[PDB]
Structure 1
Amino acid sequence: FDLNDFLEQKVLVRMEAIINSMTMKERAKPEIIKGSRKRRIAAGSGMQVQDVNRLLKQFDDMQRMMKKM
């Protein structure tokens, strides 16, 4: 369950804004994402790292559930 699938699914607009800023490797293997990338991703989608962490946390909560069925 990659960030892409998570993207399939008015604040939601900002969630996308943030995923459309990652690379295909990022969208595919989220963990590789750390400070540096975050800095690029947020600033790329006019967001703050927190928003990214926010989304990143969201996705996590999401993936987790998936890995339970």
Structure 2
Amino acid sequence: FDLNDFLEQKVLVRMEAIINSMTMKERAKPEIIKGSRKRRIAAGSGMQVQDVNRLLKQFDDMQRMMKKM
């Protein structure tokens, strides 16, 4: 379950904008989205790092389950 699937799932429209700002490598192996990338991803999706961190946290939640069922 990579960020590519979690994408299929201005309310959420912005939660998309964020991913539509990532790169294939990022959307495929999130454990590489440190500071620098974030600062890119945020300003890229007109958001803010905190926003990204939010979505990042969301993915994890929606992720762990897959790895537990």
For the aligned pair, the TM-score class normalised by the smaller chain equals over 0.9
Runs of 5+ consecutive residues of structure 2 not aligned to the other structure: none
Q: Kindly provide the CA deviation profile for residues 5-58 of structure 1, in whole angstroms up to 9, marking residues without a partner as x.
A: 000114210110000000000000001110000000000000000000000000
Q: Distance in 1 between matches of 2:56 and 2:12?
A: 13
- In the TM superposition, structure 1's runs of 4+ consecutive aligned residues that sit over 2 Å from their partners are none
Moved more, 7-16 or 46-55: 7-16
2:50 aligns to what?
50
Q: Any idea what SS the aligned residue of 1:67 has?
A: helix
Q: Percent identity?
A: 100
Aligned length: 69
TM-score, length-normalised on structure 1? Answer: 0.97
Counterpart in the other structure of 2:22? 22
Q: Secondary structure at the match of 1:3?
A: coil
Aligned-partner Cα distance in 1 for 2:20–2:47: 12
How large is the RMSD of aligned CA atoms in angstroms? Answer: 0.7
- Distance in 2, Cα, partners of 1:61 & 1:41: 20
TM-score by length of 2: 0.97
Measure the CA separation in 2 of the matches of 1:29 and 1:42: 18
Q: CA deviation at 1:2?
A: 0.4
